[PDB]
Amino acid sequence: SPFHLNDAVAIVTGAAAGIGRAIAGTFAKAGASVVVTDLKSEGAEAVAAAIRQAGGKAIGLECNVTDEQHREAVIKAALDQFGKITVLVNNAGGGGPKPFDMPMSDFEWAFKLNLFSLFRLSQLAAPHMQKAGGGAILNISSMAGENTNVRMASYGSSKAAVNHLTRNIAFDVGPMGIRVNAIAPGAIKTDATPEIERAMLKHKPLGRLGEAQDIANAALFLCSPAAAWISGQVLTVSGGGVQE
Amino acid sequence: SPFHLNDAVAIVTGAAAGIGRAIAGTFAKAGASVVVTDLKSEGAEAVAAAIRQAGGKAIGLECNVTDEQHREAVIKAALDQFGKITVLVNNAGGGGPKPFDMPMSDFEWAFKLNLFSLFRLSQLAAPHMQKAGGGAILNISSMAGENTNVRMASYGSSKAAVNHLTRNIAFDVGPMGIRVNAIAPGAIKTDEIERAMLKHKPLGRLGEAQDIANAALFLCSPAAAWISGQVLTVSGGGVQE
Fold this sequence. Notes:
- The structure is a homodimer.
- Chain A starts with 7 loop residues before the first strand and ends in a 7-residue tail after the last strand.
- In chain A, strands 3-2-1-4-5-6-7 form a seven-stranded parallel beta sheet, with helices on both faces.
- In chain A, α1 (18-29) packs across α7.
- Chain A has a single domain (8-236), classed as 3-Layer(aba) Sandwich (Rossmann fold), CATH 3.40.50.
- The first copy, chain A, is α/β, with parallel strands linked by helices.
- Chain A has seven helices and seven strands, in the order βαβαβαβαβαβααβ.
- The interface between A and B is large, with 40 and 39 residues.
């Protein structure tokens, strides 16, 4: 099997819940050593701990991906505790529908949060990846990056920039043996009601919502050697459609 | 762990050599019974026999995908042999650079060979896929479907049809629990100034068949049960024309 993460150190940000938590769990059971990360320090340690009492190796620390000190702490915490870095999964980000006349800081924040942070983490992890022979970067985008709609000024165009950064920086980091891709996930069952759900699926050909595990398998594939030759790709994982 | 094709029956067309050979072989070790198909009947039989003696189940068939009688034979041959069909890998297809003043028979052929055949084979397989509890269709496309260049009038736009058909029939057969995806492969070393492409492939390397087969295996695996209407380009991070 090439879908395993043997001898790998993976940093996973925003991993207290949902996708990033499943990516972190999934990357551990594939035999990677995980550095769980989140804005909320309790949540990072909850997931890093449950990973350990289930067999894997994992530490969890607080990280505000927009704080340059918090970023450098994660890089160092991973090297200090595991020796190398081979996988960076940039799952931290946020935002959503805002009016066009939104205050400028709202617009600028979306780019600090969704783009400036993960570019910088990649800039830090890249030379350590290079020393370890190579590695894989994965950015969790959003479907608003390739769609067009109302109230999407900051969200949809900051996630668009994530997509195009991914397509471009793979040229920069390929020579160093780094692959860079992105998943754009559909809507995931979280709620942690039936009629507003049945309407959401009116445009999802496969007829169900997503599971965090569904994103984690794609994250797995894209970060394993099974995807040794895939870089610069934006893979949409949404049951064939769009929602909400 | 979710990356296996257990209790699956996969038709792989154009699988005597190259990408389709690798796919067929990969799919067998992953647990699928495989219906190996190619224009050359005995080329397909040699692949099927290797899978069998390497431990798998498989048969090999002559099939011209452009001929409706063959298409039906292969579909029936899969059912008589294995009871069901759950995976269809539309890999056969041809063509390449052509002058703009080409004869219309060439233009039309490219669509007949790269597009109509795989849509027809999709039509024949969809009902059996639904009776079987679900399945996946994977179309082997080409980066010429999104690239633009000289001499690509027939090849580039037939393959572009394959990409959007993929995206569009995903809506149609999703309600039948069928996923439809495509792989656009780049420069695969199949069979000196080679260094041309390499000067535009960020990962410093051409592709092997198994690269394409790994992505194939993923997209037809339960690890991708919620992925559909996708064109995953597998090219080393760049473009090679």
